[PDB]
Structures are given as structure tokens and as C-alpha cells.
A paper describes a structure:
During HIV-1 or HIV-2 infection, the capsid is a necessary component that protects the viral genome and recruits host factors while trafficking to the nucleus. The capsid is comprised of approximately ~1,600 copies of CA molecules, which oligomerize into ~250 hexamers and 12 pentamers (capsomeres) to form the distinct fullerene cone. In this study, we leveraged the approach of templating the HIV CA lattice assembly on liposomes, together with stabilization by the small-molecule host factor inositol hexakisphosphate (IP6),75–79 to produce regular HIV-2 CA lattices. We report the first high-resolution structures of HIV-2 CA capsomeres in their native mature lattice using single-particle cryo-EM.
With reproducible assemblies of HIV-2 CA amenable to a structural study, we sought to resolve the binding of FG peptides derived from Nup153 and CPSF6 to identify differences in interactions compared to the HIV-1 capsid. Binding of the Nup153 peptide (residues 1411–1425/1464–1475)26 was detected by co-sedimentation assays pelleting the liposome-templated CA assembly. Following cryo-EM analysis, high-resolution structures of the HIV-2 CA hexamer (2.98 Å resolution) and pentamer (2.99 Å resolution) in the presence of the Nup153 peptide and the hexamer (3.16 Å resolution) and pentamer (2.82 Å resolution) in the presence of the CPSF6 peptide (residues 313–327)86 were determined. Nup153 FG-peptide density was readily observed in the FG pockets of HIV-2 CA hexamers but not pentamers. The density was strongest inside the FG pocket and extended to contact the CTD of the adjacent CA chain. An atomic model of 8 residues of the Nup153 peptide could be confidently built. Consistent with the high conservation of FG pocket residues between HIV-1 and −2, the model of the Nup153 peptide in HIV-2 aligned closely with the known structure of the Nup153 peptide in the HIV-1 CA hexamer65 (~0.5 Å RMSD). In HIV-1 CA, the K70R mutation has been shown to lower the affinity of interaction with FG-pocket binding factors, including Nup153,19 but the well-conserved R70 residue of HIV-2 CA does not appear to affect binding. Similarly, residues along the adjacent CA NTD present more polar character near the HIV-2 CA FG pocket, which may have otherwise been expected to interact poorly with the first Phe of the Nup153 FxFG peptide. In addition, the induced assembly of apparent HIV-2 CA nanotubes with the introduction of the Nup153 peptide was observed.
Residue numbers in the entry:
A (entry chain A), C (entry chain A), D (entry chain A), F (entry chain A), H (entry chain A), I (entry chain A): 1 to 221
B (entry chain B), E (entry chain B), G (entry chain B), J (entry chain B), K (entry chain B), L (entry chain B): 2 to 9
Write the structure that this text describes.
């Protein structure tokens, strides 16, 4: 991460033994559960790319998904190189216009990542940009690992409505379907995949029943 | 979309 | 959250790895127990909407209730838009009169949420307002999830009076019945749903017996 | 709680995730054991009424005793209103002479509780006063919940003297008998309720045997 | 009312 | 405890949730093991009598020994009153010459205990003095609770020498025998209570064998 | 009296 | 580690009880898993060689690998001596041009390691250099301990593709094969060692299938 | 330990509840494992003798070894008295030339130990010197407690080579044999005590095989 | 190469 | 004496 | 020698 010192200067403070570890656990216990993405962002808020890398590295399992993340990171970095104009060379006094190897956190050091981040000319959030590219790779993994699909999440005869619903909304998040299509699934596929007796209870309510209405109505059905 | 029900 | 720095400036400090996690656990172990609402408020005291969101997001289960909270948050936000006059456009120098997407924590950033919060003209508690809207959604969920109802909480033949009472007062809180109706239930439904032998002990006391009086009297009955 | 800032000002700092939780556990694991009262006081030393409330609220069980505490808090508050003269109305510039709804922590905010607490005219310990009223409600609960009574705490034939004594002195605390009556019970009821063989050992010592003397004498009897 | 027995 | 503030002033900071608790556990898990006395001193270093009391109070069991400690505290306090001259009354501006009820931590407040502690005229260690009186009560309890006696700690036929020794030296500490008598027991009672075969091994060494010598010699005997 | 063996 | 003080001076702060311990555990629980190397680097970021040594020392098991690390540390140190010119002797006022015994952390003190590190003339990262030499010894150990080899990591008939892949990519890291050879193994050995039915699914995709493509395609095969 | 305050003064800060405890555990869980010595040094870095004593004291078991440490501490202290000249008496204004009872941490206070430590004339590391004397007593105990001897650590027919080696190198450390003799044992006794089949594998390598070479060669033998 | 999939 | 093997 | 494989 970064901390400030007398005179307006900035320095590299280290990442902590309880955050690297909590990330390792969130990735393992939850097995790239959708929540891994905000669990990562929060644990890395105020961090630099060097530590974001070390956190992801310390994880020693699910190394198939860590590679999917690495392929996604290299792709987003190749776009930053493609869109940026790589202007005329700058003097040694000045630091290299940050490139994709630099933000991804490989070619560059940690003191140059901070420099850009708190550079007066153009403070650049190298830490936030690399982290965003990762949320994409992590999100792809959540979906790649999703145990089921929302279409196949259906109420079991003795399964309760709320439990069936918990699975349905969780999958809707992880599958990361477009928001407009999420509204269609919630209002249609959920009356459709539910047991018939509970389905009739929701149908008895009328049209566009709110979830509070549906969850209350099929309570005990 | 995203795995962020709340926020951006 | 927010911390202050030399010169009277404010900055976004991050939320912590032990609070996100404790909220996740309070929501899961207690399963949206009534206490989840103050457990949330305390864990989020001095926070900004961005983190209040990340905390709620990290929770990866009970996603049916997290959606009820999200529907309640969008409703309270639509009222803030409905009541506020959306005055004439302000210059870039000035920040947008906070709107509902902004307080709910979506459209806006974290630096604009803090700016308003410590804005000299009108410091606005965007963090507290969004959190209050949530306590409403969480409270609705406590009630939606309440396992029983106070009317059906009745002393079992071998169940003791205090245990029956613990359930009755807990349900009174979660059902969130109006305070005047809470006084009627405590003084009537509790002599009514109790075993007859213990009910007669409370009746032997007289009228409007205090709880200390009733709890002491039926001790060993 | 409260912390101070440059210029001699005071602010509301929040209560912590490890104190709310430790109080919740002390109340549950010990089940309103006598120690709950100092466990509460220590966890709340330097706190304001707002947090003292949130701590008590987070507890989601033993809600029969939390109501006994609430009835005791409303009674002590009604006495503060009864004894105080509610002087002539003060200007908006000045803050309301603190009342019982205000100290109990309901009608008032947290910034007005701190203001009074660090008010130059008359710093008022609103936090300590409300906490004291609670120790009374908690103490009543310890006693209401006390499993046994000191008179019925008697040495079992194979039970050792020290274990019988541990129960006797613990009950003496929880029953909260007057100190003069505590001296009578310790010097009389304890030779009286003890096994006869051990009772004769204490009698062989003579009159007013100290506990060190009695505990040493009946060791192995 | 609320799930806050104590306070506001 | 106590912390200092700008201007050379002192204030009461509170004791912590992890120290009260660790003391409670050291007293319970170890059951007033000899180590309870330094475990207490370290947990209370920089503390004031008010907290030393609250720590001891929070303990809710072994209340027979907590009373032995309280009788010892009242005895040491009665000696401070007996030896001190209770000089002529001092003005309100000045604080009461500290008395035994005051140091024991009862009659006095916490702000008067700190005042004396950092009083320019005669800084008095009220915290250390009361704590010392307690180490005496705790030490008496260690001994009152000691499961065995050093004379009866003897090597069992299949018990090893080192284990027999560990018990012997531990008891020597807890029984708190005079140091000169501790040298006699270590050099005589230990060749005496040991198995005969191992006893002959120590005798074969010669006179005044050091422990390193004895522990090495009877290794495998 | 109280559940405070030590102190006030 | 090192901390700074008023006047621009530097001092040796100590390493912490939670980092030494977490390193001990990462080395044991993971048994020199590849992740041990970044787990070590992060736990030692801002440290000096003296503590890097104490951490490695506290580990009391896998002492065969700790010796491999020590042989690697002595080899890298002998190269620093071989390449450096050991210039003309410097005065007592000046500190010895750092040598290999000094950086490895043996011959030198901790105050001379910090001095060089924050020496105005040439701040030298003695802490980082020694740590790098270790990552080499630790990396050799990961490989020496690797349970299997990537060539022998093959999909089992009922084993799923992703699990086979997790092992393959993990081994690719630990075996630390050259990056060009890692691309060949991932695109060839993985279609080769996989079950035939799943192998045909990857072959049906075409040439150079990405992992997201392969992992998705053989899902349920 | 010690902390500094405005004006260049020093004070006694206390030792912590997590270090005393971690030392207690390292001494017990590891049972005076060789690692206890650096686990102690790190937990006590920046400490004073008073706390180094309290840590060692809190340990309530293995009291045979704590006495060996105490005999070693008194011996090293008697040498400091023997070598030092006990110069002519110094005034009350000046503090006593530190003696062995003083550094061992008995006769002296904690404020006189710090005074000497930060004394301008001759800052003396009383904390480090006493700690070193202890590492000697602890090291003697590691060896006294060592379960086996390196000569008797031999590969079992089904035991693997690395496990046999782990024991051999661990014992080499604890037995604390001279470094020159450690090189002979590693290159001779280890080909000698190993199974014959694995011994021939090492012999097939040639002369002075490095451990990486031997550990790799007998992998699977 | 190394056991660092991400970074240098 | 005391339960303090080391120190005063 | 010592139980310190690394350092002094
Ligand atoms: O009971 P304690 O002695 O306080 O120790 C535990 C322990 O941490 P510490 O030993 O550092 O205090 C836990 O962590 P681990 O050591 O097992 O890794 C930690 O929980 P985490 O595992 O989540 O860190 C937990 O505290 P908390 O849950 O607040 O983090 C804490 O005990 P407490 O819960 O009583 O503080
Ligand atoms: O003072 P320590 O012995 O180190 O122990 C902890 C630790 O302190 P450090 O930050 O210095 O390590 C906690 O911080 P982290 O380890 O988690 O970073 C910190 O709490 P925070 O987690 O909120 O920073 C807590 O003090 P506090 O709770 O007052 O902030 C503090 O002291 P305690 O052990 O006395 O709780």
C-alpha cells in the first residue's frame, strides 16, 4: 500500500499478514464465490499493484482460475498499450508513461507505481485499474465455477420456496446476466421453476408480485 | 452485469 | 469510512477486514436476527455508503433478503428524488446536489460522498441516511424470516415460563408491532398463552403484574 | 464513545466490534452471571449512552431480562425528572438541561450527550449515570436468574468443602444480601449447611474461624 | 416499531 | 490505567477487553496456579486500583479464594492506616492523604488515585501497592489450592526422574518455603523421595550434584 | 449490596 | 525491521509475534508450498536481515530444507564477495563496505544493516538482497519437495478436468520450468495427459484453445 | 520494555498480554524446542530484564529447566561481578555501576535498568546481556531434553531419507556440536546411518555430495 | 522461472 | 518466599 | 555451537 510522511512525500508501506491471509481464505472457503470480488477490493483498498499481485500469488490452489485471471490481466493491459499513444521518450528525471506491464505490476517497481499514483501532473490510480481488470477475471471464474445455472435452479418438492429463491438470486449474480434479462427471469422463470402448489400461490397474488409479497405468500406452502 | 448487487 | 488530515481536509480511509467479516457472520450465524440491524449500524458508524454497500455485497447467501433490502433502498431513494426539488444546474466547481442513486451508493464515487458529508455549506450524512434505509430493509427481513409469531409463542407443558417469555419478547421486537399493542400483548396474551397452573400463579398476583413479579412468582411452577 | 481533537473540541468516535461482541458473549456464556455487571462497565468505560444502548440491543436472547433492565432504566429516569426542577426554557444556542429520555439514550442524539459530558459549565457524566441504572437492572437479573439460594447451598456428602464454599460465596454476591447479613451467613450458615464431619472440624477450631483457617482445616475431610 | 429496545 | 495529555496533565484511560479476559482465564485454566501472580502483575502494569479491582471482580468462580484475597487486602490496608499518622486535615484544594479504603480501591474514585500517582509533591504508587497486597492473597491461595506437598512429591516406579522433579520444584515455588529450606529440600529430599535405582545413580555422582548433572545422569534409568 | 466484592 | 524518529534518524524496531508465527505456519501447513516464497516476502517487507534470519530460525522442522536455503545463502554471498572489489580500508567513522557475511546477517549487527540501508551515500537494500537469495533456496525446496511432476499429473478416469488442471498449473509453477516451455506444456501435454473423451472435447474445439474455452467445454464430460 | 517521551526522556512501558503468552506456549507446545531460544529473543527485543523475568516466571511447568536457566543466570552474573572492578562508591546522584543481581533483574528496579540502558555516559544493554545468559540456559535445556542423539538418528527401513535427514539436522542444531564436527557428521554419519540401498545411491553419486544432490537422488528409493 | 505467476 | 523464581 | 542456523 502507500502512506504519507512529513514534507508531502509518499512511501511504500507493506500489505498486512491478516489481509493476504483473509483473501487466501475467501478464495478457498468460498471457492471463488461471487463475494470474492468485493472481499478482494475491500482488502486491497489503498493498495498498490505489487501487493495486489502478492495476495493473488500467495493463493496456492485453484491455480487454473488464477491463470484465467492472468490471461484477462494481460488482455486488459494489451488494450491500455493499444489505446495509449506511447508519446515521445521522456527524460530520466521524468518516469515512464505507465504501460501495461507496469500497471499489471510486473516490469515496474513499487516506488514508480506510487510515484504515478501521487504524481502532481496526473495522479494515476495504477492500483485501482489493475484491481478492476482482476474483478473481471475473478468474475469470469465465479461464473466458470458456478455449480449450477439459474434455469436449472428449481424448487424441490420438499425444498422450501425461500431456499430455492436464495439459489436463484445467487446464480443470477454469479452468471452475471444483463440487468434487463435479470428482471425477466425474476418475474417469469421463478413462477415457472417453482413447485406447482407454490406457483399457484404466486399466481393467486396476481401480476408482478414483489418478492416480499411472494416470499410471505408461499410461507408454509 | 456484475457480482455487485449494491453500488456501481 | 473517512479520516481527516493536516489543513482541515478529509480523505477516504478503507473499511476493515474484521468488520466486513463480522457483519457477514452476524447476518449468517444469526440468520438476519433482529440484532443484525444494530450489529450493522455499529460496524458502520463513521462509514460512507461505498463501504456500507461492500459489506452488504460480501454476504453471499440469504441473497433473497439482500434483494428485499435493495428494493427497499431503491424505494427510499425514489422518495428523496420525489421530495427534493432538483434545483437549477450547479457549476463543475460545485458538486451535484446529492440524489438517490448517489446516496444509495451507485452513481456517485466515494470522494463525492465524503465531500458532501464534510461540505461546509451543508454537511449531509449520506452514510447515515443510506444506512437508515437499510435498517428498514433488514427489519423487514427479520420479520419475513421470523420463525414463529408472538400469538403462537405459548408456554409448553414442561417448557419453563422464562423460556416461553424470552421467545415472546424476542418475537415482539422482530414482528415490530406498534408500542401501544406491545403493552397489550405483554399484559394479556402472556397470561393467556402460558400453562394454566403458571397462568393462575400470575392471576393470583393480581392486575398488571410487573415482569420481575411474574418471572419471580412462576419460578419453580 | 468520545475522543478529543485539536482546538479542545470533542467528537463521537464509534464503539468497537470486539466490545459489543464480548458483552454479547459475557451475557450469554455466563447467562447474566454476576460478573456481567463489571464486564459491562469495563467494556463501556469512556463510552456514551448511545453505544451502551447498542451493546445491550445487539444481545438477541435473554430478552426477558433486557426488558427488566429497560423497566429499571425508565424508573431511574423518571426519578431524575422528578428530582430535577426542569428550569425556565434555555435559548437554542444552549442545549436542553439533560432529561431522562436523553440520558437513557432515546430522545437525545450522541453529539448532545457528548456536549453535556464535556460542557464547560457543568460536565455531566450522562454515560456513567445511565450505565449505573443498568448495573441495577443487570444485578436484579443476576438475582432473578440465580440458579439456587445461599441457604440451600449445602455441602454434599462426597462434595468437597471448598466447592460448597465457592457456591455459597458466589450466591452471597448474586443474591446481593446486605453486608452485615453476609457476615452472619459466612460465620453461621456455613458451619450449619456443611457435612457434619467437616462441620465438627470447623467447630474444633473454635469461634469465628477465618476462611483460610476453615479451608485449610477441612482439606482432606 | 423497531428492533431497538433501548434508545431511539 | 493512566495516559498523559498535552500540558503535562494525566487522565484515566480504561483497562482493555483482552486483559480482563486473559486474567479471568489465567485464574481459571490454571486454577490459581503460581503463575497467576505474575500473569496478574504484567496484565496490570501501568494500571490503577479501580481496574485491578474490576479484573479480580470479573472472575466469577473460585470466589472462596477471591474472598481470601479480600481479607488479605483489608489486613494490609489496616496496617497502612495503623503506621501512617493521619496528619492534620488538609484543605479541599488538596486531596486526602491516601488511606487504606482509598488504595484498596473502594472509598476513593479513579481520578484521585491517578492524582496521587502523578502528584508532584509525592507521586504515590497506589496501583502498585494494592497490587502487591493482592500478590500476597493470590500467593496464599496458590498454596491453599496446591494439590500436593513437596514432601509427598516422590518419583513413581515407572514415572521418570524429570517429571518427578518438575512437580517437586513447582511445589517448592507454590508452598513458598524459605529460600534456605528450599536448598536443603533440593539437595536432600530429592535423593530421598526418588526411586532407589535412580537415587543410587545420583549417589554415584557424589555430593551436591547440580541439577544438570542429576537430570543427565538418571536419563534412561 | 452489590456484585462488586472489590472496590465501591 | 526499521522505523524513523525526529531529526531524520533511523532505529531497529523489532519483528512481530504474529509474523514470525505466520511464517512458521506457512512453512509447515503448506510444507514449503510455492506460496511460502511470497508469504515470506510480504511478512518481511520493510524488515532487516537480522529478523529475516530469526523468522527462518524459529521454524524447527523441515530443517533439511532450511539447510538447503543456508547453502544457497552462502553461495550467493560468496558471489557478492567475488564480484565486489573489497576497496581500500575505510576509517572507523565510516562503516565496512557491506560483505556477504554481513548481508546474509551473521558477522554484522542490526544497527550497521540499517545504517547501510538508510546511508545517504549509497542506501543499500541489505534486507531485500538477502531475502532474494532466500526466495531462491525456498524455490529450490518447493521443487525438491514437489510431490509429483507436471508430466505425471494426468486426468484420472473419474477425476474432473479442472482438478487435473489445478494440479498441472500448480506443478508448472513449483517445477519452475522456463516460461517458453510452460506455453508448450499447457497447449500440448494437457490435451495429451487428459482422459480420451475430454481430450476429444478439447480437440473438437480446434487449435490453441484458451483455458476458459477448454475448462467450459469439458464441464460435465 | 522502554518507550521515549518529549524532551528526550525514557520510561518503562509494559510487556504485552500476547508475548508473555506466546512465550509460555512456545516453551510448552515445543517443550523447549531449539526454536524456543529465537522465539524468546524476538518476543523480548526492545525489552528490559524485569519483563524477561516475568515472561520466564509466568511459565508454570518444565520448572526443572527454568531452574537450570536460573543456575546458568547466577553463574554468568557471578562472572560479571568477578571481571568488573566494583570501582570506588559513586554519589546518590549517580546510579550504582550495574552488578549481576541488577542485570539478572533481581536487586535492581526497572527504572534503573532503563536509566543505564539509555545512560548518556555508557548506555548498557542490561536487557540484551541477561537475555544472552538465558539463551545459554535455554540451549542447555534444549540439549538436556533432546529426545534422541544424532548418532542414533538412523533411517528406518520404510522411513524415507528426507524424514531421517530432518531428524539428523534438527539434532545437530539442538546437540549444538561444534561447527567443524557438524561438517564431519553431515558428510559421513549420514551415509553411515542411512538404509543400505539409499546409502549406495549416495555412494553412487561420488564424494562430498551436496544435500540437494543427495535428497534428490534418494527420492523414491 | 519463478513461483510468482503475477508480477516480476 | 515467593512464586517469582526470577527477579525480586 | 548454537541453535541459530542463520545469523550469528
Ligand atoms: O482468543 P485469542 O487469544 O484472542 O485469539 C484468537 C485468534 O487471534 P489472536 O491469537 O491473534 O488473538 C484468532 O485468529 P488466529 O490466531 O486463529 O489466526 C482471531 O480470529 P481470526 O482467525 O479471524 O483472526 C480471534 O479474534 P477475531 O475473531 O476478533 O479476529 C482471536 O480471539 P478473539 O476473537 O477472542 O479476539
Ligand atoms: O497493538 P498491538 O499489540 O499490535 O495489537 C492490536 C493490533 O495493532 P497493530 O495495528 O499495531 O498491529 C490491531 O491492529 P492490526 O494488527 O489489525 O492492524 C489494533 O486494532 P486495528 O485492527 O483496529 O488496527 C489494536 O488496537 P485498536 O483495536 O485500538 O485499533 C491493537 O491493540 P490491542 O491488541 O490492544 O487491541
Amino acid at each position: 500500500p502507500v502512506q504519507q510522511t512529513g514534507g508531502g512525500n509518499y512511501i511504500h508501506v507493506p500489505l498486512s499478514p491478516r489481509t493476504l491471509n483473509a483473501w487466501v481464505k475467501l478464495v478457498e472457503d468460498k471457492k471463488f464465490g461471487a463475494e470474492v470480488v468485493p472481499g478482494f477490493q475491500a482488502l486491497s483498498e489503498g493498495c498498490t499493484p505489487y501487493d495486489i499481485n502478492q495476495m493473488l500469488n500467495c493463493v496456492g490452489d485453484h491455480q487454473a482460475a488464477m491463470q484465467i485471471i492472468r490471461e484477462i490481466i494481460n488482455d486488459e493491459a494489451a488494450d491500455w498499450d493499444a489505446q495509449h499513444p506511447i508519446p515521445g521518450p521522456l527524460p530520466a528525471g521524468q518516469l515512464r508513461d505507465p504501460r501495461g506491464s507496469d500497471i499489471a505490476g510486473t516490469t515496474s517497481t513499487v516506488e514508480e507505481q506510487i510515484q504515478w499514483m501521487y504524481r502532481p501532473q496526473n495522479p494515476v490510480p495504477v492500483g485501482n485499474i489493475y484491481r478492476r481488470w482482476i474483478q473481471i477475471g475473478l468474475q469470469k471464474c465465479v461464473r466458470m465455477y458456478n455449480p449450477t445455472n439459474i434455469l436449472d435452479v428449481k424448487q424441490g418438492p420438499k425444498e422450501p420456496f425461500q431456499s430455492y429463491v436464495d439459489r436463484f438470486y445467487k446464480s443470477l449474480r454469479a452468471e452475471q446476466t444483463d440487468p434487463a434479462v435479470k428482471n425477466w427471469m425474476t418475474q417469469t422463470l421463478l413462477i415457472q421453476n417453482a413447485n406447482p402448489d407454490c406457483k399457484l400461490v404466486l399466481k393467486g397474488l396476481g401480476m408482478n408480485p414483489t418478492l416480499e409479497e411472494m416470499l410471505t405468500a408461499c410461507q408454509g406452502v | 452485469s456484475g457480482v455487485f448487487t449494491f453500488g456501481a
